[PDB]
Design a protein around this ligand. Structure first.
Ligand code: PLP
Ligand code: PLP
Ligand code: AG2
Ligand code: AG2
Lengths: 630, 629
């Protein structure tokens, strides 16, 4: 049954209604706001294959970016209406989360459909500013500038203001103020200034600009005061328009958001008190994504929802302004991750497995030692008539017996054959223990968890973790991962997913299912005869940019898919992934020379009939996708 | 003033390739003869004169050459001490660093040791093609690991067809049938190895299936299935190599010795079943001492080079003596140890946040008591204050400051009050740090906290995520040192921050004379003068794991040979990415954008200004992604 499978995965806890399992047992995406047509992801794959693109593939749904833009804006609007807050919310997209022109254009495109009709982007570095200015060349835009600012970064930012953008240069180091004033004078521009504030409510040391605590940016209380003082002196206090703080990405605890906003709102009111007219209050990033579906205060989740995040921000800022009797600023959030995580799915195939097949326990030959007979006797006592206690005993004896076998092999007591026999016999006992024990028995359940790991299939997935999913390796980030098809049989097996790199770390340690994080995943059985497709979801934020070429596996193919009015699958942009030859160039091999040398060597050492064949396979290997063929 | 050399103790991790000379400069000494030390700042000046700015990755192929000879000599010495009756063969696994310039130089050694062999290991389909391309000129030993499809298998067998010795190591049971089929198809006799799963390295590793994450290798039972199938095909002679790999950076020599013991027993058991295994490949694992402490920790190891080699050779030897069997050729795949030292990442410190001593102002008459108490702490803090009173001033001040932050947060204090409190505290810390004594057992740990409280932040012009990825990913420690003016390294303490917009772009730990610290002693930063830092031991796995966070790309890289008379020879130069390179990677049409700027400026900017501005936008696009001082 599919509907019992649906409760085993509980996709809806993490998918936000963008993905689900349909009645044919296929995973779909539903990316349109009218929710009009669902599309089976496997059917998108079938259509890529027709066009000669093989998996792995990264698939983007812009229609999902559009909805996130509207949801985040809707959430703050609701909060504004409920509080009767007397100013606006502005969404601003930090490009660091995902810089791809096709992501950023779709984000810009919905922002234009919004009532403010207000474009907002944030750059965190010189190269990002130039990218941001390129991508907002068409219309006047809010641009917030963060990061380390040299002369050239400041002059480019002022050039942007000259050319008609609203460019906020956020002061993050005290020396930058003096640089901005000089460069603005030199370009004849009226600069717009924001200030980044250091907070004392988020940990020891962060209030301090100097010192060995690692928050890089932001001005001290003292430094903030110096800014106001320097501006008053130059008759430029009106250029300070923006107050900024950034708590960090993926804030799991709503309390920290509240404490942060509380402290910042007070700074904002104190600055107006000293005469500055701050128009904007920018709460930075930090709006988390619920990667594991558990809504918990854990590093892969959050204990709050979208609207509640909005309310904590609006209410706190509003309450602090009412106390000071100050007017309320435009609220900005830089919510990159929330905007981008859901829109992308990585698809690839399971190209082989290592699974345990139950074989027959052969009886001990006269040659076998007591220890191995003991295991044989355990195997005979294991059946439907073995009681609940005695099954546990047999588990414990069998583990101890295998451990002793391993020690005797290591010291020269036992032959390779003895070891083999004991290992296969143990696996047979484990396999049966796993069938005889009951999940309704309280003392069997912990063992059945143990046994579930011990008997899981290894699934080798045609992809590189280091390339497509770097946070998995680097910070034990969890992503939901699921078979795309045949989900009626998801109770068949348990499996762990490994990548095809020659590295221990290219394996997933954690899975998302119906009750949260597990160490293995329930899956349909694999067959050599049918394609078996898997999906990594919530890969939309920070994954693409951060991946690297371990083992010379390169970029995957990527495509943009829009679902049309009548349910068409419009494949709108297509980016081809790396070939082996690309990777060879990247590491400075002269490939044209390699090809030509190959012509010689083959004519030298190969029989004439074969030569064309051998040369074709060499040339073809160079020109192939880095990834493997089933 | 050579307490400086002793503060850093560079030789504890440098292996004699880097040190400080008597002019206060970091030098490299890359030749085996150690004939000429070249100051690393002179390499930078020489690059500056060719229009390349830091950040720069500098690589020294003569260090690679020495690494190959040191590892071979270590094994050869162990072989001679034991009287081990067979040879050692070093095989380089290109996964550690795939650059042609690195691999060439390793290969260029291979040629020169009178046994005149060394090999390459590939661990995936595309590495196999890179290895085949890199050994095109000469016949070679090639070991193939990783997940093998039909194409990988056929390429490997073609490699053998063209004269290489290609060992296709079986890592999965199903891959034996595939090899045998395809070898028949290409009419080639295969050479096979087998990777074996060990039970001595932790629970679950012995098993092929199951949830434990050791990807590759055959279980004892599958090893026997291999023997049985090859006996039936009459192809048992094709199995020539036994393989295992424990993992990289093995810190505990005990694990090495346990792994070798177990695997030697597999080797001798296989011979017992008529297999004629000739090669015994112990994989990687041979660690690098990143912090110079030679301790059993994630960044270091409890053993040395010769010791590693003795543990291998003596263990294989003793077990063989036990079966009365012949000893095999020993192979190690020691990538990391071959490559870590040869490369240095150099960049400049382009700004700082430092605390500058300011006088503490008397509280205004409107100030609350709490801020008066802090004032009173400050007055009681001078050369007359006794040792115990210094600690109590330290504790009152921290308590005061904390209470100030709670009062700001609930509306009790103004920003001006907070500002005054924070600056007074810093002044009190700065003076505590001068009045307390290193000779006093109870000041020392306060001075430890003060060192951090008072450290300079140095902003280095590079991206940790691009150039030192393991530092972010696995808290890899790398030595980091300033390159110049080292006579002055007692000036201050600093932490190094990269210029990315990201909290994680900082180094948490530093290597000084004591091993690992949380700050580094350094010369003072001056705006007027260049300040260069080196990150060392970046040779293995850094270059290829780096990513484009915040759109910072590749740095320049160059290859430097020191000639017989000391000439600095800059033999290859790879240019780093420009802003335009990055924009194009994220699919912006840069040439269209160039054009639209011309449109936009001429329509929006006063005529007398247009050329200036357009020249600035274009110098923006064509410039290195990194910043200018
Ligand atoms: C990185 C960053 C962001 C993004 O935050 P997310 O929560 O990941 O979306 C926003 N603002 C600033 C200043 C950042 O550096
Ligand atoms: C990664 C790897 C190596 C390299 O080991 P290092 O200790 O990092 O030098 C050697 N052999 C194999 C099979 C590997 O996968
Ligand atoms: N994804 C990065 N590697 N780290 C995220 C940091 C962003 C601000 N805390
Ligand atoms: N530093 C790399 N990411 N990991 C290397 C692991 C390789 C075999 N243990």
């Amino acid at each position: 049954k599919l509907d019992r499978v649906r409760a085993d995965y509980n996709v809806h806890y993490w998918s936000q209604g963008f993905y689900g399992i349909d009645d044919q047992g296929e995973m779909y995406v539903s990316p349109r706001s009218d929710n009009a047509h669902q599309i089976q992801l496997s059917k998108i794959v079938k259509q890529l294959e027709e066009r000669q693109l093989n998996v792995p593939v990264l698939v983007r749904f812009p229609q999902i970016l559009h909805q996130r833009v509207h949801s985040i804006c809707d959430a703050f609007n609701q909060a504004i209406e409920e509080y009767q807050y007397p100013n606006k919310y502005l969404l601003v997209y930090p490009i660091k989360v995902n810089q791809q022109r096709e992501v950023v254009d779709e984000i810009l495109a919905s922002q234009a459909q919004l009532e403010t009709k207000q474009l907002g982007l944030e750059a965190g570095s010189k190269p990002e500013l130039l990218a941001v200015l390129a991508m907002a060349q068409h219309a006047s835009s809010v641009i917030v500038c963060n990061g380390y600012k040299d002369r050239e970064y400041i002059r480019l930012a002022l050039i942007g203001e000259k050319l008609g953008h609203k460019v906020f240069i956020v002061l993050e180091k005290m020396s930058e103020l003096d640089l901005v004033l000089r460069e603005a004078k030199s370009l004849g521009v009226t600069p717009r200034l924001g200030i980044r504030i250091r907070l004392a409510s988020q940990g020891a040391g962060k209030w301090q600009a100097s010192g060995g605590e690692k928050s890089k940016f932001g001005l001290s209380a003292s430094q903030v005061l110096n800014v106001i003082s320097r501006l008053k002196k130059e008759n430029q206090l009106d250029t300070l328009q923006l107050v900024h703080f950034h708590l960090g990405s993926q804030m799991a605890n709503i309390r920290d958001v509240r404490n942060g906003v509380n402290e910042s709102a007070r700074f904002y009111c104190e600055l107006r008190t000293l005469g500055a007219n701050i128009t904007y209050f920018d709460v930075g990033g930090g709006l988390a994504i619920d990667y594991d579906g558990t809504r918990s205060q854990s590093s892969n989740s959050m204990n709050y929802g979208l609207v509640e995040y909005a309310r904590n921000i609006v209410n706190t800022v509003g309450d602090v302004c009412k106390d000071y009797k100050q007017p309320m600023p435009v609220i900005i959030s830089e919510s990159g991750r929330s905007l981008t995580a859901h829109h992308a799915v990585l698809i690839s195939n399971v190209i082989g497995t290592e699974t345990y097949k139950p074989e027959t326990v052969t009886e001990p030959e006269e040659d076998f030692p007591l220890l191995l007979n003991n295991m044989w006797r355990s195997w005979l006592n294991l059946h439907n008539g073995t009681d609940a206690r005695a099954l546990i005993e047999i588990y414990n004896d069998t583990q101890s017996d295998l451990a002793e076998v391993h020690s005797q092999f290591a010291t020269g007591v036992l032959t390779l054959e003895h070891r083999a026999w004991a290992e296969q016999t143990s696996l047979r006992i484990y396999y049966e223990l796993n069938r005889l024990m009951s999940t309704k028995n309280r003392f069997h359940r912990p063992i059945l968890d143990e046994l579930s790991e011990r008997l899981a299939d290894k699934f080798f997935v045609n992809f590189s973790l280091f390339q497509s999913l770097p946070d998995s390796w680097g910070i034990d980030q969890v992503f939901p991962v699921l078979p795309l098809s045949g989900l009626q049989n998801a109770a068949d097996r348990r499996a762990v997913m490994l990548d095809i790199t020659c590295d221990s770390d290219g394996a997933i340690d954690a899975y998302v299912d119906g009750q949260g994080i597990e160490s293995t995943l329930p899956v349909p059985a694999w067959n050599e005869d049918e394609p078996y497709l898997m999906g990594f979801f919530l890969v939309g934020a920070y994954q693409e940019i951060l991946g690297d070429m371990h083992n010379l596996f390169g970029d995957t193919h990527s495509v943009v898919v829009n679902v049309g009015d009548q349910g068409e699958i419009n494949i709108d942009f297509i980016n081809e992934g790396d070939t082996v030859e690309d990777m060879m160039r990247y590491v400075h091999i002269d490939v044209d020379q390699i090809r030509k040398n190959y012509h010689s060597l083959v004519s030298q050492r190969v029989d004439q009939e074969e030569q064309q064949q051998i040369l074709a396979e060499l040339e073809q290997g160079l020109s192939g996708y880095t990834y493997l063929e089933d």
